[PDB]
């Protein structure tokens, strides 16, 4: 589906916060004892609405809610951390979960350069037929 | 299925689970992102009277929590200390490792009472309460939150401009009676004995200016009892969203003490 | 191994309950505030013993217990939610964890249609040899 | 390895970890299922005296919990409120998010006392206690469970008939002394002062019929003290498993009060 | 990177303990009620410094600490059990996350025996050209 | 990225995330291992006075826990019962399912007092406190730990010699004042009224020999009050690491009672 923003308004800029999951640490600052408190672990930045992605993203989050809420109703985990890992596994199973039939629409194997290896090799014996 | 955002033809779309696009590339779990977006950003009313009507108490539904990795700086967050008239707590204490939303310009801190007819407080529109990288279906006691929703994305490995002046936060205190009902009443707190009767039309900037005017003009309570100021409708206040947007106030006094602030 | 039911009895019908992990929600029923309580989230159905699958499944659950209990003894997680995701990962690593050698018994790549692309192409230059 | 069920040649088998079948297809995590199956379904005795002998107390072994996604409707579930003679609890409270087994025709609710010589109660045959989509190695206090075991399957993506009249549940109350020992004694509760001495041969349907006969015949206690009825062996009762399967009772009375119910 | 042990000392032998995640159980010992207590679930062994692996491993654990601590600072899970599963997923996504172009340096498909199937088949029609 | 150890050319190396080696084979999650290694094994001082200076109290940093599957038998582990002078606990109780480190030759059990100026005790060098297959950033009360660090490996499927006399453990008790400061003082406990003033140079083997000498020579307190022995510097004691390595002591006595043990 395409994303159609159907909200009353859209803030087209996203002033975000996140964590630096792999910071280039400065001396001993990586050691919990010396490092920042809970409030000082965040980095910030600003994204603008290039390609309408901010307005799309607001709408996407909105539309995600029903399926997410139904997923959370059905789980017995109190805190769910595994949604993105499960997406990654499903990405892989979609492509590599069965036998990969080359030239099929569901096999992501490209033999174009592999043709050029053997189509260059047509003349390896048909041209050299002395 | 839970939707997954992907960028094709310079545009964000939901990934189609029936189709298989072999040109889509996921070379690392780093390309997968969960993001919290604030209801604020969709133009919803953020004043305390409007905001609190979106929340309601319910029993029989176990709470649920889901993490999100990145969020949006909020103008408006909320922090609730609500009791029943008998003094017992309406909201549960924050579970271990659930801290407040990390970036709030204004924290609307509401204390007071209501009937609280249900074990947990939920969002009536199905949104989440966003805390520090954990989104919950319910409100925890004394813990700052933003109202929001979560998206999941496959980022293209090329586009690096996707989640990589200081941070200042101000607490605005309110007292409430009949919380979570039709006949809810709110008071903005200037000090422990000086209050202002709250209207939906009052912005955070107006509330802070009004409080600073009351302090400097010397219109706080100079008495053991409670002083409640009122603002009749001809007073100007700041319908525009936050991202796109003195000596003239005359005070007059009418156990207790009610009063009017004119222009 | 084959599954041999070695129980004193077998109930050949399975009256089951489960959750609808992705319900086609009816208006506002997906919103936790409006939706069902914990007791009302279940769907039910009835499976019969076609192919002896119910009696097999009872025996399978029985035989699974020892290995499952030994797995739970060795884990330090209080609640284990990751067994099926770990199976999925192992399914993928079994097939795609090393170099896939085509025509080998451990590579699940089918080039049969890929032969028909190049065996049709024998006559692309040997038949057109004017 | 933990076994995994797969269907080949119209038959369920354990997946061989040494072999690799390239024709096996796992195109989604939805094809993977965990299922709870009830010991009931294998023909084990479900009466309270037989069932409770399969459970025992033990210290030094930490409890463990594993989820399962789908289960079987049970005829018989159990719910235990056992104390030591000194009044202290034998069983721990249900952890957060562990609710009772969701589909029970009869809940056998046992209250009473035993020595409880161990920190947790385990299944002596290595089975699990099945709760709401969580299987535990131990019994939690006051929380309805079914005895069962868990299987894991790869479903074939073709076969859709694999986990997609109302639901009625009846509580049968029992009092117990010497719980978890050789000399355990059980009483079926008609009311708070009227009891029946329990035998292994009494089915739920017999217990409910006996109780309804006692109420309508008027053979409840009409005295401050305890009335314990007995059923001598020539009384008929419903060895067949549950899925494949009046005015004739004469009552006679022999601080306390013992008595016999003849035919 | 190579591992260079830069510690004041190295104990070159590793007297280890671990759990038997899949024990060949002895009668009823797998049943929690009958089995060992928490203190009796361990197996032991002794590894020597063949190939300098013990001294390398001590140094590796040391060097791992900063990145691990930064990872733990950024997570909101109280107890992290998913690091090795996430490594496995990333192993798979590195190789199979896109279209596999045969003969490329990032595609782990070997067609050497597949050449021998078709290079043996050069003479299937060029030699049999009667 | 978190480093991952791999064996190439008969040598352990960190896996390069930029490169892709197609000859590397990961055919199962069993080939992935997390391992806890003890700081002991790198030659750090293990005496209680040296060890405790590596730990310190800090607020504002939430604790974090990560599992590890296999560990090393420790010579030296520690178990802390520290209170403030007002009697309140300095360290939190062990969370559910966090048990002590499973293989310790000597458990150095320290009881006493300090200012404890922070909510949790962390390792000042960024190491972990290793418990039973769980490594924590913080010290839990009364729970035996080893100081250590964690590695992650891809094992080659060929090399089976990679994690597949009895086990004896001895508790050495200490009393402490000014714990976690510059002016910390330690006493080795012989019995509840007989102590020895602790030095960094005392090994576990010396402490146990000294205690056994005190008992057999009869130099324990035979009085209601506290007897503190001292060992002046000319007494020999066992700088070598643990893995590579009588009737001559004369005692003389100087409310309370101080004294000297000569040679
Ligand atoms: C994703 O984005 C969409 C679009 O922005 C959001 O859509 C909103 O959905 C909620 C429903 O959950 C709507 O809330 C309801 O609005 C109804 C209509 O309100 C209008 O009614 C008067 C009279 O006609 C108008 O003058 C005025 O404009 C009002 O706005 C109300 O009738 C509802 O209230 C009644 O029912 C609810 C039951 O939920 C009771 O609790 C109330 O007490 C009351 O009886 C209700 O308020 C909302 O209007 C929708 N917005 C838009 C712009 O369409 C989604 O909510 C959003 N998803 C998430 C998860 O955030
Ligand atoms: C998977 O499915 C199988 C097959 O159904 C189950 O097998 C059962 O295994 C348990 C062991 O855990 C068996 O229980 C034991 O039975 C012994 C024999 O019982 C018979 O003995 C008398 C005299 O010969 C017979 O007349 C009568 O038929 C009895 O049934 C008992 O000796 C055992 O009791 C003694 O030892 C136990 C130790 O565990 C003590 O606790 C007792 O106090 C007592 O001293 C014990 O009861 C059971 O019989 C097996 N059933 C069958 C049909 O073979 C598995 O249990 C099942 N797995 C799971 C996880 O559910
Ligand atoms: C991985 O392995 C490496 C190598 O073994 C370890 O490296 C150690 O790193 C720590 C830092 O965290 C070092 O500790 C610091 O040592 C400084 C120097 O100590 C020497 O100083 C005197 C005077 O010169 C010498 O005579 C003597 O040899 C001392 O050893 C000290 O100055 C530091 O103390 C001061 O600062 C700290 C701040 O952390 C304060 O807390 C103190 O109160 C004090 O003010 C500090 O002790 C250590 O020396 C390094 N060792 C080596 C061999 O180089 C890593 O720690 C290890 N990683 C992990 C996670 O275990
Ligand atoms: C593929 O290409 C190279 C030249 O790039 C060629 O020399 C080689 O022979 C070809 N491979 C095979 C297996 O013939
Ligand atoms: C509460 O709301 C209005 C007052 O604004 C009132 O008329 C109505 O009766 C009340 N609702 C209920 C359900 O009692
Ligand atoms: C206002 O009251 C609160 C308690 O309700 C108290 O903590 C605070 O110190 C008081 N402030 C003043 C200025 O009296
Ligand atoms: C109210 O005004 C006073 C006077 O400057 C100030 O100290 C106080 O912080 C103000 N209240 C708020 C909520 O900003
Ligand atoms: C004292 O309070 C009154 C209102 O009750 C107000 O008018 C007056 O300004 C205050 N006193 C001073 C000195 O400001
Ligand atoms: C494969 O088949 C098509 C016809 O279906 C043919 O035209 C094409 O040339 C073949 N591919 C290559 C690379 O030669
Ligand atoms: C309990 O069981 C029987 C009574 O049925 C008794 O003879 C036996 O001695 C008792 N068992 C033990 C271990 O004391
Ligand atoms: C029976 O006793 C229980 C408490 O043990 C009580 O809750 C219940 O109301 C009593 N019922 C009657 C009918 O007396
Ligand atoms: C016992 O019979 C009475 C009389 O109808 C009934 O109210 C009660 O529920 C019965 N007890 C059970 C356990 O069904
Ligand atoms: C009162 O109880 C007695 C037994 O103690 C019983 O025989 C009698 O039927 C009861 N009374 C009535 C009126 O049913
Ligand atoms: C590959 O090799 C076999 C002999 O091992 C040969 O008979 C067969 O024809 C070849 N495959 C194809 C598709 O030609
Ligand atoms: C503690 O350490 C020394 C005593 O060894 C002392 O000289 C110093 O002043 C103290 N440190 C601080 C920070 O007060
Ligand atoms: C020593 O004191 C502790 C309590 O501080 C006590 O548990 C122990 O029994 C005492 N031992 C002796 C021998 O007095
Ligand atoms: C101290 O010596 C006595 C005498 O044999 C012994 O009982 C006690 O365990 C010793 N203390 C320690 C810590 O080993
Ligand atoms: C009693 O204690 C004293 C030291 O106070 C010691 O010299 C003496 O040996 C002890 N008595 C005996 C009989 O050992």
Swiss-Prot record, chains A, C, E:
Outcome of swapping residue 34 to R: Almost complete loss of infectivity. No effect on transport of GP to the cell surface and incorporation onto virions
Posttranslational modification: Palmitoylation is not required for its function.
Effect of residue 62 to D: Reduced levels of expression of GP, GP1 and GP2. 20% loss of virus capability to enter into host cell
Region of interest (Fusion peptide), ranges: 23-38
Membrane topology: Single-pass type I membrane protein
Disulfide bonds: 10-55, 100-107
Effect of residue 55 to S: Induces GP1 secretion. Complete loss of virus capability to enter into host cell
UniProt effect for mutating residue 35 to A: Almost complete loss of infectivity. No effect on transport of GP to the cell surface and incorporation onto virions
Role description: Acts as a class I viral fusion protein. Under the current model, the protein has at least 3 conformational states: pre-fusion native state, pre-hairpin intermediate state, and post-fusion hairpin state. During viral and target cell membrane fusion, the coiled coil regions (heptad repeats) assume a trimer-of-hairpins structure, positioning the fusion peptide in close proximity to the C-terminal region of the ectodomain. The formation of this structure appears to drive apposition and subsequent fusion of viral and target cell membranes.
Record-given protein name: GP2
Whole-protein residues included: 502 to 631 of 676
């Amino acid at each position: 589906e395409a994303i159609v923003n159907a909200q009353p308004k859209c803030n087209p800029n996203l002033h975000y916060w996140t964590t630096q999951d792999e910071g280039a640490a400065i001396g001993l600052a990586w050691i919990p004892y010396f490092g920042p408190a809970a409030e000082g672990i965040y980095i910030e930045g600003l994204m603008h609405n290039q390609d309408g992605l901010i307005c799309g993203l607001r709408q996407l989050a909105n539309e995600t809610t029903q399926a997410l809420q139904l997923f959370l109703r059905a789980t017995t985990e109190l805190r769910t951390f595994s949604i993105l890992n499960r997406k990654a596994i499903d990405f892989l199973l979609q492509r590599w979960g069965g036998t990969c039939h080359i030239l099929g629409p569901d096999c992501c194997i490209e033999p174009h350069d592999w043709t050029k290896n053997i189509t260059d090799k047509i003349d390896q014996i048909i041209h050299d037929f002395v | 299925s839970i939707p997954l955002g992907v960028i094709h033809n310079s545009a964000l779309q939901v990934s189609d689970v029936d189709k298989l696009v072999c040109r889509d590339k996921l070379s690392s779990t780093n390309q997968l992102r969960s993001v919290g977006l604030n209801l604020e950003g969709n133009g919803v009313a953020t004043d305390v009277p409007s905001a609190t009507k979106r929340w309601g108490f319910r029993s029989g539904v176990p709470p649920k929590v889901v993490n999100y990795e990145a969020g949006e700086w909020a103008e408006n967050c909320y922090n609730l200390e609500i009791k029943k008239p008998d003094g017992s707590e309406c909201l549960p204490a924050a579970p271990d490792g659930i801290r407040g939303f990390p970036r709030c310009r204004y924290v609307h801190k509401v204390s007071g009472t209501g009937p609280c007819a249900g074990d947990f407080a939920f969002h009536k529109e199905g949104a989440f309460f966003l805390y520090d990288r954990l989104a919950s279906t319910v409100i925890y006691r004394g813990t700052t939150f933003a109202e929001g929703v979560v998206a999941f994305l496959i980022l293209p490995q090329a586009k690096k401009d996707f989640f990589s002046s200081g941070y200042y936060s101000t607490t605005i205190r309110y007292q409430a009676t009949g919380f979570g009902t039709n006949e809810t009443e709110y008071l903005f707190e200037v000090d422990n004995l000086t209050y202002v009767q709250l209207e939906s039309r009052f912005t955070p900037q107006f509330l802070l200016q009004l409080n600073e005017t009351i302090y400097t003009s010397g219109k706080r309570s100079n008495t053991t009892g409670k002083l409640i100021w009122k603002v009749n409708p001809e007073i100007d206040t700041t319908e525009w969203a936050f991202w796109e947007t003195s000596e003239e106030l005359s005070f007059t006094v009418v156990x207790x003490x009610x009063x009017x602030x004119x222009x």
